[PDB]
Design a protein around this ligand. Structure first.
Ligand code: NA
Length: 90
RNA sequence: GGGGACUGCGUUCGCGCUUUCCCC
């Protein structure tokens, strides 16, 4: 497909001094056939935040690695919201 | 029996699994 602009809203998390979580909006250029996992790769390259630590949400949907951006009907200027994933357990 | 930190993960976002531990 044709590459589109996808935005990622990064958290503002200054206590995470190992990453660059400064509230910025990342702007990536990717085709709509690219999988959501590619967004995590590019977020890792820009913030240092590993993919396994990223929680992505698009229009309230917890988008999954194996689906393409087109699967979620993303378009130019779509904003993906990034959060820190927190693990649980008993 | 509670809370944390991790290593990876899953998730319906409620948490759950796991890995090293650390405490109360
Ligand atoms: Na719900």
């Amino acid at each position: 497909g044709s590459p589109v602009s996808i935005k990622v809203q990064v958290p503002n998390m200054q206590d995470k001094t190992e990453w660059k979580l400064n509230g910025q909006v990342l702007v990536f250029t990717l085709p709509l056939t690219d999988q959501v996992s590619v967004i995590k790769v590019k977020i890792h390259e820009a913030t240092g935040m590993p993919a396994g630590k990223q929680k992505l949400q698009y229009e309230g949907i917890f988008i999954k690695d194996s689906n393409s951006l087109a699967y979620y009907n993303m378009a130019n200027g779509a904003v993906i919201h990034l959060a820190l994933k927190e693990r649980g357990g008993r």
